[PDB]
DNA sequence: ACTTACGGAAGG
DNA sequence: CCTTCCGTAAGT
């Protein structure tokens, strides 16, 4: 049975109604406004025509945040929100006070009545952010918008030369960037162009026609372009008839850059190709200063001090290019000359499965996991094999957390349990299952309690009062039960002091052949700053991109600003697993040979460079002999699945013939087929009647339940469903079913289901990432895990963080 | 331990 | 109307 979940009394307090049955007239003074709104008297300067004036800086009640009625009826927010006020508005002064964070903060985990204030708000991103600390009438509200205002504006600095025409320069600078002449600049995929010129047998096939809809699941038709990249060669302004520089029209110049899908040799050249490698050009084209979406490093790669691949992972948006590419004579050639020139946190994983989330913090170099908790014992066994250094407690979260909630020291076995002051970050999935959306018992006990480890992970925040948190969870934690839960746990966040946000990130954009989008809650203690959300790092398909959320019918999103492009091309299929010998229906043998080396950028960075022929875990399930005709019968097209299957009778791998499914009753819906023929395979086809217990029909090449169901699950669009090389995964679940909700699990060639080690590589695991138990235990343990690349772009905008804060305690120290 | 049959809300 | 996709419970 699942266990009840443990809470401190703050916890316990905000979640108590949610999971019952689960938990065990001077400047500076406030002034109330008929709408009332409460508002901050910032300067009382009487404004002349207009009677006596007073700029109010307004405050955002609880109520107007994402926090809704779940927020305390007396805490304020500041906003960046303020104006120009009538005095004969004021109804009365009210009291607000500021509740500050104690220095005992990070230990009061454990444990009037008027207007109060702990935290600023941004009312687009729902970031609850410390009260920034802008030094001096005096509006904050005032001065932040200007010292925002005045960053966005592109502005021309360093004159270089003064033409007739046109005045050079040698800098310039946008949204707090800073580019120069001979810098690498990104451009829209439309900033420029490259001097390159670009009937069914409905007896025999009976599903066919549930494919209607011409959309391919894991498709990337519609992928967009990475970014253009150029080399900076001439900043320059427009003079006016004035005879003076346009300084609001900065034009740049740029040298081309082509990738290697740019050339005439067209996409096959970026299957072996570095996803950073470039094609130097003579040719230039002319762009506006607005168009430019960011700065990049391109560099000659033999000019370069260290290795090219040395210099690739250094830092990032850094490209290389070693030869020039002569596009009307579609030659390639040697480039001309002028073109050649802290400590770590201590982090505590509750739910750490055999540990994605705390492999790629650990790829970051932020974060040193010392203790991890998972009751389940395959995922600990492998955490183990992944995480030498670090105390992985094989037990139920609710029972270590009343353990240390107690001066225990140690639970039964002799580990050592954390202490307040040991946990510097707090990282977890909590389950996900009783969130899914494949969840359709969502309402029961079980997923009820699952659910309710929310709460568990809440409290040990609370508890332990750690620098950073991290929640990740699917999607739908972010509008389960109207975003209840989500709002809950920001106000049990808020309710700590925390600076907290939330948003969604697709995986696809940060390096794997997979769309996986998971909801991301972060906290930040009082001292500390807010992270931001990564910036995508890969091109995605859009459809897969859907961030976006919804709470009290208002929209949220986070900080990304790489909607649509990005510097780096999408992972395919083909880059995911194009390298790994083939193999059977039912593969057992643990520790085979590479049948070569890595073919793509994507598995040159899973394997590694050194020379390793052990290839593990390209094991696949052994489906049984209707199963495997059934695999055998999808063919090859992109978006194959059990739609096109044939009814026709097969002789199995064993002494027994499967049968033709038999249509017999008439859907009304789906019509008759061409031939005439039925298209039910029960009454239940007719609108309001109970289906008939003897319709079921057993041995069937085309599964009967799918038809039977179909008209009401997307026509179970997926199922039986083969990869296509040049798209994506689907979403990679515990267990690949071709039955499953997720059924789209079929080898792109190979009449097999995917491997463990293609369905890590989905997830983006280093090839040599520990698994551990049998098939299905180290499935469910690639199904779960956090994929290792969105870790690490989210713990390196932690480590962001953590060099910011360091740089102004330095600077607070040496004066 | 293995196989199958399969609900309903969010958001486009 | 179409697609979503850390899956569960009952049967076997
Ligand atoms: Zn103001
Ligand atoms: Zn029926």
Redesign the pocket.
């Given at each position: 049975g699942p266990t009840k979940a443990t809470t401190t009394k703050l916890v316990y307090q905000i979640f108590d109604t949610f999971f019952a049955e689960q938990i065990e007239l001077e400047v500076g003074d406030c002034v109330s406004v008929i709408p009332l709104y409460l508002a901050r008297v910032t300067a009382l300067w009487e404004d002349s025509s207009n009677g006596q004036m007073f700029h109010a800086h307004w405050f955002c009640a609880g109520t107007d945040t994402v926090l809704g009625a779940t927020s305390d009826p007396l805490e304020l927010f500041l906003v960046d929100e303020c104006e120009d006020m009538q005095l004969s508005y004021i109804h009365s002064k009210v009291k607000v006070i500021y509740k500050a964070p104690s220095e005992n903060w990070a230990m009061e985990g454990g444990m009037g009545k008027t207007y109060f204030y702990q935290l600023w708000y941004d009312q687009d991103y729902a970031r609850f952010e410390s009260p920034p600390k802008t030094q001096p009438k005096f509006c904050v509200s005032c001065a932040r918008l200007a010292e925002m205002r005045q960053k966005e504006i592109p502005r021309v600095l360093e004159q270089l030369e003064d033409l007739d025409s046109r005045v050079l320069y040698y800098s310039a600078t946008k949204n707090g960037i800073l580019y120069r002449v001979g810098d690498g600049v990104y451009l829209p995929p439309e900033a420029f162009t490259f001097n390159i010129k670009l009937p069914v047998d409905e007896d025999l096939y009976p599903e066919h026609y549930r494919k209607?809809?011409?959309?391919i699941?894991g498709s990337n038709l519609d992928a967009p372009e990475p970014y253009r990249i150029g080399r900076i060669k001439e900043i320059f302004c427009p003079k006016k008839s004035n005879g003076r520089p346009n300084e609001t029209d900065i034009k740049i110049r740029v040298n081309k850059f082509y990738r290697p899908e740019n050339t005439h040799k067209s996409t096959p050249a970026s299957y072996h190709a570095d996803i950073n490698l470039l094609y130097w050009s003579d040719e230039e084209a002319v762009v506006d200063f607005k168009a430019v979406q960011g700065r990049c490093t391109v560099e000659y790669g033999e000019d370069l001090p260290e290795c090219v691949q040395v210099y690739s992972m250094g830092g990032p948006n850094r490209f290389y290019f070693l030869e020039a590419y002569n596009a009307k004579s579609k030659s390639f050639e040697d480039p001309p000359n002028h073109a050649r020139s802290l400590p770590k946190l201590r982090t505590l994983d509750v739910?750490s499965?055999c540990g994605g989330l705390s492999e790629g913090f650990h790829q970051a170099g932020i974060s040193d996991t010392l203790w991890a908790i998972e009751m389940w014992d395959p995922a600990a066994q492998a955490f183990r094999l992944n995480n030498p250094g670090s105390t992985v407690f094989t037990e139920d979260c609710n029972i270590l957390l009343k353990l240390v909630m107690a001066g225990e020291t140690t639970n039964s076995r002799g580990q050592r349990l954390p202490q307040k002051g040991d946990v510097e970050m707090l990282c977890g999935?909590?389950?996900?299952?009783?969130?899914?959306?494949?969840?359709?018992?969502?309402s029961?006990?079980?997923?009820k309690f699952?659910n309710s480890l929310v709460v568990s992970f809440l409290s040990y925040c609370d508890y332990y009062r750690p620098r950073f948190f991290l929640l990740?969870?699917?999607?739908?934690f972010?509008?389960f039960k109207?975003?209840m839960v989500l709002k809950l746990t920001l106000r049990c966040l808020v309710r700590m002091g925390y600076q907290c946000t939330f948003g969604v990130l697709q995986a696809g954009q940060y390096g794997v052949a997979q769309?996986?989008?998971?909801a991301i809650i972060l906290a930040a203690a009082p001292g500390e700053k807010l992270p931001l959300f990564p910036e995508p790092l890969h091109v995605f398909a859009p459809?897969?991109c859907?961030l976006?959320?919804?709470?009290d019918d208002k929209?949220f999103v986070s900080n990304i600003t790489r909607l649509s492009s990005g510097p780096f091309r999408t992972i395919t299929v083909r880059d995911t697993m194009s390298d790994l010998p083939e193999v059977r229906n039912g593969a057992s043998a643990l520790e085979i040979s590479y049948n070569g080396e890595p073919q793509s950028w994507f598995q040159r960075q899973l394997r590694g460079a050194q020379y390793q022929p052990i290839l593990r875990d390209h094991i696949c399930?052994?489906?049984?002999a209707?199963?495997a005709a059934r695999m055998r019968h999808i063919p090859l097209a992109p978006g194959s699945d059990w739609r096109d299957l044939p009814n026709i009778e097969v002789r199995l791998s064993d002494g027994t013939m499967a049968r033709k499914l038999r249509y017999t009753h008439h859907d009304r819906k789906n019509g008759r087929s061409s031939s005439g023929a039925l298209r039910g395979v029960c009454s239940?086809v007719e609108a309001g009647k109970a289906?008939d217990p003897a319709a079921?029909q057993?041995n069937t090449l085309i599964?009967?339940?799918?038809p039977?169901?179909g008209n009401?699950?997307?026509?179970?669009?997926?199922?039986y469903g083969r990869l296509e090389w040049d798209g994506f995964f689907?979403?990679?679940?515990?267990?690949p079913?071709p039955?499953?909700?997720?059924?789209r699990v079929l080898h792109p060639e190979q009449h097999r289901v995917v491997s463990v080690r293609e369905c890590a590589r989905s997830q983006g695991f280093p090839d040599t990432y520990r698994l551990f138990g049998?098939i299905?235990d180290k499935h469910?343990q690639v199904?779960?895990?956090?994929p290792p690349p969105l870790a690490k772009a989210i713990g390196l905008e932690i480590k962001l963080c953590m060099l910011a804060k360091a740089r102004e305690s330095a600077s607070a120290k040496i004066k």
């Open positions: 209607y809809s011409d959309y699941k739910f499965g999935g909590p389950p996900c299952q009783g969130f899914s959306g494949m969840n359709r018992f969502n029961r006990t079980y997923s699952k990740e969870n699917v999607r739908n972010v509008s109207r975003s769309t996986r989008r998971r459809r897969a859907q976006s959320v919804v709470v929209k399930k052994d489906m049984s209707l199963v239940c289906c079921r057993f599964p009967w339940c799918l039977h169901t009401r699950h997307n026509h179970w669009a997926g199922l689907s979403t990679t679940v515990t267990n079913e039955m499953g909700k997720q059924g049998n299905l469910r199904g779960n895990a956090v």
